[PDB]
Amino acid sequence: GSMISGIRVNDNCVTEFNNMKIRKTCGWIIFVIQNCEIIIHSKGASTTLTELVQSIDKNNEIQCAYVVFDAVSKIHFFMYARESSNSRDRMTYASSKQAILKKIEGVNVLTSVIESAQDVAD
Template sequence: MSSGVGVNDNCLTEFQVIKLGKKYRYVIYKLSADNKEIVVDKTGPIDSTYDSFTAELPEAEPRWVVYDFEYKLDEGGQRNKLTFISWSPDDAKIRPKMLYASSRDALRRRLDGIALEIQGTAFDEVSYEAILDKAKRSAR
């Protein structure tokens, strides 16, 4: 199901900056005030911590995020995975949750190079440990 919303060109520009330029740790996307297009909400500098990123997620509003997730394998190797997070907290109102769910693919289809996808309705589902576990499992 598609909501018919567009994707602002700046969303793709900022995605390329995180993917190729490595200048951000994350990009948070949201729907515009009129719900007609997806826009960039915030970006996080490359030296951002995971905790500072999760602090940027609203407790009662959906968002989408591309996060450049860095982790170490048990064998010692360093890895990065571009991670797409659909944030739809339990406390969000039903209408925005439905609109974000039906608009997700409009954004996701335009982002080439995503290695992990996470859906979170509570902060424990998007915790560093939860993402790390999924990243390590996908590396096998």
């Protein structure tokens, strides 16, 4: 069996995600794992997705995270893991990605991990 499993999304994640989707009071949310729970790290107003990831790149408090970004036509969801992140941290974020995806609906799930702002130049 795996060392880490059964990590859970707290209700507040779904609450704020729905605030974003329905009430449009923010344009992005960053989720992290703390105390074996997925919680909200921060949220804010959408400029561009590139600008969001640039901010994340410069914020060393964030090693890995799940991110949603309201691009209006779609809400993108992705895992972020900076190149310098620890492989074992990446493994637990990877395995817990399914947990947050079960709790939030209506997102476009990106097919690649985002490591830096270069990766979102699509």
